[PDB]
Design a protein around this ligand. Structure first.
Ligand SMILES: [K+]
Ligand SMILES: [K+]
Ligand code: NA
Lengths: 579, 577
C-alpha cells in the first residue's frame, strides 16, 4: 500500500487485483467504517456484491440517534468515496455533487458564536484573544508526538491559555476536555491549520442537507442495494479467534450469536473480516418532555470483543482506556428540542439575525453560552433537519460539555433533567423572562427529548504507543480493525467521519492489494503559505512585527525580516499579510 | 474564477452555468489547447457540441512527435479522466496511461555517454558543488527582479560545466540565452522530481506518438459530442473594439479555400485564440536531402502581430519569433532502423532488449563530447502503429546548430538525414568503415526537420509580452497555449500548460463554478524543499554541503537552535540529519 496526493492518483481507477473472485467479506458493524469498507470492496477491490455480508446488530422529529457531525473540504478519502455514490435528492448526481452544490447555494457561517449574560453576544466574539498563549500552541506543534505520549492538554497548557476565546471555540466545537489527549489536540492543530481563518465564524464548516441518516447513510445503502450487497439483520457478534504461526498472525475462527440462535464461522483467508470496534453511540438512553435519562459504565459487544482480542495478542490494543473511568464531568448528555410554534423563534433569531423559516442555515454551528455552568452549547441546522417536520416546526440540538455542574437556573445536573428542564436552562440563558419560562417551555410550545451517552467522549481519551492497534497489525492476514478507535499510520484525526473512511480504505487496499494511492492526510501543515496564514489569523490579524512574543524572539524576527528584504520569503510574508 | 486543490474540488461536477445556450465558441487552432478548450466547453460549460467550431488550418514523421509528462499535470489529468481510451475499451485515457506506467515504468540506465560509447563516469551526479547555492539564490530571487533577464547573466561559468546543467538544458531544451524567469519557474514547478531527473524516473510517457495517444481520443470524444470541425481555414485577423476600458471581438477575417471570408460576432460569440506557434514554418528533408533553412512567418505569427497592433494588452510576438540565434535548436530527425544490425549498440547502452515492447532509453541520451550536443531517444516500441515488427524508431535532436560535427564536418542544419545518422553512429562507436553502409537506406532511413521556432517559448520576456489568457476587459476573447499568460506560475513548453489555459479560459469566460487546480504546490511543501536540498547536493547532509562561510555559520546556528524539535524530525526524514 502507498500514499499519494494530486489529481493523477485521485482520478485513477485501480486495476482489479489478483484473485478477488475467490474472496469474500464479513463486515461486522454497520458503522461508517464498515460500510465504507464494503463500498471500497465493490468499487476498487471488485469483490462481488453477493459476496459481501455486512453483519448488523439491529433488526430492521427529535432523533438523537440519527444525528451527525460537520465536514470540511479536506476530507480527501470521504470525498473520493462519496463522488462514487449516487444521490437520492438530486437524481443523476453523486452525493458529493449534491453536497457541493448545496454548500455553494447555502454556505455555512455563524453570525453569533459566543453569548453570555442571558442573551448578549460576547463583545470579543470573533477574536481568538490568545496573546502570548499563541506561542504555547506553536510549542505544541514544535513538540514531537512520541514526546507527549499519554500526556494531557491540562498538563501542557497554562491557566491563562484556558481562559482564551481560542480555548472556548476549540473545546466546545471539538468536544476537547482538559483531561483529553494532548497528542490528539496537536493532531487537530496540524490537520485543520488551513481553516484557522474560519473557526470562530464557522465558515470552515460544511453540512449535509439533513441529519446523518437521511443524507449520509441512505444514499450509501441504496448504492449497495443496487450493487446487490448482502444485509443481515438482528445479528449479535461475540468474538474472533487468532493463531500465531512464526511471526505471522492469522484469523482462524469467529464465534457469535444471531436472531434467536447461536452460530460459528471458521475462516478461509479468502473470507475477509473487518471489525468496526468500539462504539460511542452504544447504551444510549432516552427521556422526554417530562422524563430524564440514567447514568452507566455498562460495556457491550464492541468493548468485550476488543478485550478478547487484546487477550489473544498484544497487538490488538489496550481497550479499557476508552470505555472505562470517564469522569462525571465528561460530556454525556445530548438532547433534541422541537419547537412546535414561532413563540421562541425570536430569541434564536435575534442571535442569528436570520429567519428560522427560510430553509437556510441558522446558527451555522454551535452557539456556546460562555457563562453557563454546564458550558451549554446549542445549534440549529438548516431546516428541515428531518423531512417528517411540518412547515412550522424547528429542531434544536443541545449539549453540555460539563456534566458535574449545577445549572444557573435549574440547579440540577443536565443528567438529572427532563427535556423540559434542559429546555428551561437554555431559555434562561436566552433571556426568556423567568415568569414566562414554564408556559414557553411546555409541550404545547416546545417538545424536548434528552439522551445520555456513556461513551461520547471516548475517542479523545489519552493514549500510549500500542494502546491503539495498527489497522493492519504486523503479520496479520485476513483481519483488520476499522473506525475511530483503530490506528491509521497517518497523523489523521479521530471524532471525524474522514478517519472512518480512511481506515476502511487503508484496510481494503492493504488486505486486498489494491494498486492505487491512498491520499495522504492533506498536507496543509507542511505548506509554508498555511503556516504564515495561520500565524496571521491566530494573532487576530497582526503583522508579524506586532505579534506578542518574548523580546529576544521579537528581535530575532526583526533581524530575519531585515535579511530577507526584497526576497521570495518577503513576498510570501506579504502574501500572508505579515508585513 | 477561482483556484483550488484537493479531492473535493477535483471530484466535484460544476453546475450548468447561466445562459450557455445564447453563446457560441470559435476555436482558432486545432492544437492541444484548442481541443482542450472544446473539451472543457462540452464537459463543464456544457455548451452544445454543434455550437463549437474548431477552425483547423488543414485539409480533411517528426511533426507527429510529442513530449513526456509527469504525475502532477493536474489539469491534464483532470481532462483525460473524462476521455475514453481507444486502446483500452471501457476505460478512460488516464486509466490506460496509469496502468501502462505501472506495468512498464520509465527509467534510464544510461543518461550521459562520451568517448564514442562510454558511459560518463559521473552519470547520476548533479555535481553542482557550491553552484547549488546559485540555484537557491534564484529561487529566493523574486521573479519581478529577474524580468527579461537571461540564464547566463545569473549563473557562474562553473555552474554551466556541472552535470546539472547538462541534464537540465538537454532534457528541457533550455539554451543559455533563454528566459531566467522560466528556468526559475521550472525549478519551482518540478522540485518534487529532483530525485528523478538523472534517471528519468520522474518521466511518464504515452503508449504511442502524441497524435496517436493524446490527440485521437480527444478527436473521437469531441466528434462524438458533435463538435464541428471546419477545415482548410486560414484566419488572418480578428477585429476588436475599445469601449470605455472594455475590449470586444467583432469579426474574424479569414481566408478559407482561397476565398476571403468573414464572421462578424456578437458579445455572446466566444473566440479562443492559440496565439503563436513553435511548429509553424517547419521544413522537411530526407535520407539524401537536408531540410531548407527558413525565416518565414506563417499564419499564426502574422495573426499575433495584427492582434498586437489592435490592443496593447494583446502581447508582443516579436520578442518570441524574431532574431533567434543560429546556435538555437532547429533540427529534429527520426531514424527508422530497418533491421537488427545496429541494435547491439543501443542495447549495450540500455541494458535492455529493443524488441520486448518495453521502455528502452527511458528518455534522451546525451553525448557530452559531441559538437552538436547530440541527444537521442528510443521510446517504448512501436512508437507508430505503422511500423513493421522489425522496425525501431529513434529520435535525434541537436541543441547546438552553429557547430561542425565530429565525424560529419558540417553543422546539423546543413546535413542530410543520412549525415545526421552517420554522426550518431560515429558517437555510438560504430567502426568508421562500417558507418556509411550502416547509415545507408537499406539499414536506416533518417528524416530531418528544421523548425524555426522550436525554442520560441523560452525566449526572455517582460511583463505584457505574453497576453493574459483573458485580458482585462475582454468579454468574448481569450488567448490559449504556451504563448498565453496564465496568472499562475506554471511552466511553458508543457502540454499541461495548454490544458491549463483552456480550463482557465473556459471557466473565466463561461462562468463555470468549480475550482481550477492551482499549480501543484510542491515548492511550498517543506518536505519537498528539504528533499530538494538533499538530492540536489548529491545526497549530502546539510552541514556537509558546500557553502560560503557566513551562510554556513547561519546554518550551524540554526540547526543548533531547532535541536530536538519537530523541525529536527523533518530534517531527519529528509536525511539531512
Ligand atoms: K495540494
Ligand atoms: K525495452
Ligand atoms: Na441525496
Amino acid at each position: 500500500m502507498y500514499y499519494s496526493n494530486g489529481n493523477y492518483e485521485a482520478f485513477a481507477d485501480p486495476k482489479k487485483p489478483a484473485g478477488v473472485d475467490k474472496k469474500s467479506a464479513y463486515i461486522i458493524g454497520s458503522g461508517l467504517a464498515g460500510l465504507s469498507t464494503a463500498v471500497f470492496l465493490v468499487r476498487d477491490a471488485q469483490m462481488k456484491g453477493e459476496n459481501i455480508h455486512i453483519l448488523e446488530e439491529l433488526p430492521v422529529a427529535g432523533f438523537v440517534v440519527r444525528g451527525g457531525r460537520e465536514m470540511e473540504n479536506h476530507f480527501e478519502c470521504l470525498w473520493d468515496m462519496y463522488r462514487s455514490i449516487p444521490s437520492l435528492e438530486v437524481p443523476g448526481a453523486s452525493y458529493l455533487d449534491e453536497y457541493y452544490w448545496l454548500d455553494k447555494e447555502d454556505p455555512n457561517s455563524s453570525n453569533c458564536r459566543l453569548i453570555y449574560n442571558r442573551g448578549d453576544r460576547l463583545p470579543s466574539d470573533g477574536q481568538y484573544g490568545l496573546g502570548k498563549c499563541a506561542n504555547e500552541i506553536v510549542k505544541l506543534i514544535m513538540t514531537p508526538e512520541k514526546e507527549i505520549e499519554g500526556q494531557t492538554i491540562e498538563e501542557f497548557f497554562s491557566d491563562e491559555f484556558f481562559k482564551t476565546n481560542f480555548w472556548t471555540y476549540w473545546s466546545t466545537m471539538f468536544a476537547f476536555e482538559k483531561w483529553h489527549s494532548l497528542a490528539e489536540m496537536r493532531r487537530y492543530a496540524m490537520r485543520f491549520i488551513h481553516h484557522i481563518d474560519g473557526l470562530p465564524d464557522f465558515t470552515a464548516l460544511k453540512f449535509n442537507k439533513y441529519n446523518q441518516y437521511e443524507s449520509m447513510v441512505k444514499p450509501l445503502l441504496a448504492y449497495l442495494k443496487d450493487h446487490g450487497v448482502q444485509f443481515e439483520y438482528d445479528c449479535h457478534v461475540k468474538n474472533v479467534e487468532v493463531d500465531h504461526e512464526g511471526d505471522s498472525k492469522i484469523a482462524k475462527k469467529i464465534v457469535m450469536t444471531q436472531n434467536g440462535k447461536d452460530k460459528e464461522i471458521d475462516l478461509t483467508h479468502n473470507d475477509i473480516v473487518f471489525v468496526t470496534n468500539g462504539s460511542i453511540t452504544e447504551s444510549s438512553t432516552y427521556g422526554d418532555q417530562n422524563t430524564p435519562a440514567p447514568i452507566t459504565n455498562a460495556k457491550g459487544d464492541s468493548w468485550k470483543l476488543w478485550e478478547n482480542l487484546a487477550k489473544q495478542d498484544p497487538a490488538f490494543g489496550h481497550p479499557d482506556v476508552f470505555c472505562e473511568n470517564l469522569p462525571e464531568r465528561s460530556w454525556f448528555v445530548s438532547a433534541t428540542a422541537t419547537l412546535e410554534n414561532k413563540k421562541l423563534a425570536p430569541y434564536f433569531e435575534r442571535l442569528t439575525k436570520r429567519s428560522l423559516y427560510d430553509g437556510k442555515v441558522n446558527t451555522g454551528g454551535i452557539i456556546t453560552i460562555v457563562d453557563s455552568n454546564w458550558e451549554l452549547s446549542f445549534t440549529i441546522h438548516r431546516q428541515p433537519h428531518f423531512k417528517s417536520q411540518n412547515p412550522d416546526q424547528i429542531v434544536v440540538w443541545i449539549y453540555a460539555l460539563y456534566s458535574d455542574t449545577e445549572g444557573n437556573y435549574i440547579k440540577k445536573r443536565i443528567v438529572d433533567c427532563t427535556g423540559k428542564e434542559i429546555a428551561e436552562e437554555l431559555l434562561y440563558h436566552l433571556g426568556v423572562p423567568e415568569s414566562q419560562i414554564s408556559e414557553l417551555a411546555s409541550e404545547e410550545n416546545m417538545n424536548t427529548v434528552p439522551v445520555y451517552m456513556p461513551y461520547i467522549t471516548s475517542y479523545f481519551m489519552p493514549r500510549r504507543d500500542g494502546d491503539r492497534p495498527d489497522v493492519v497489525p504486523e503479520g496479520s492476514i485476513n483481519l483488520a480493525f476499522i473506525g475511530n478507535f483503530a490506528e491509521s499510520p497517518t497523523r489523521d484525526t479521530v471524532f471525524t467521519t474522514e478517519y472512518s473512511v480512511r481506515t476502511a480504505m487503508e484496510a481494503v487496499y492493504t488486505l486486498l492489494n489494491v494498486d492505487r494511492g491512498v491520499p495522504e492526510v492533506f498536507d496543509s501543515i507542511y505548506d509554508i503559505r498555511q503556516l504564515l496564514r495561520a500565524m496571521y489569523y491566530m494573532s487576530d490579524k497582526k503583522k508579524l512585527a506586532d505579534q506578542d512574543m518574548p523580546l529576544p524572539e521579537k528581535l530575532a524576527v526583526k533581524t530575519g525580516m531585515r535579511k530577507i528584504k526584497k526576497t521570495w520569503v518577503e513576498e510570501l510574508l506579504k502574501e500572508a499579510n505579515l508585513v
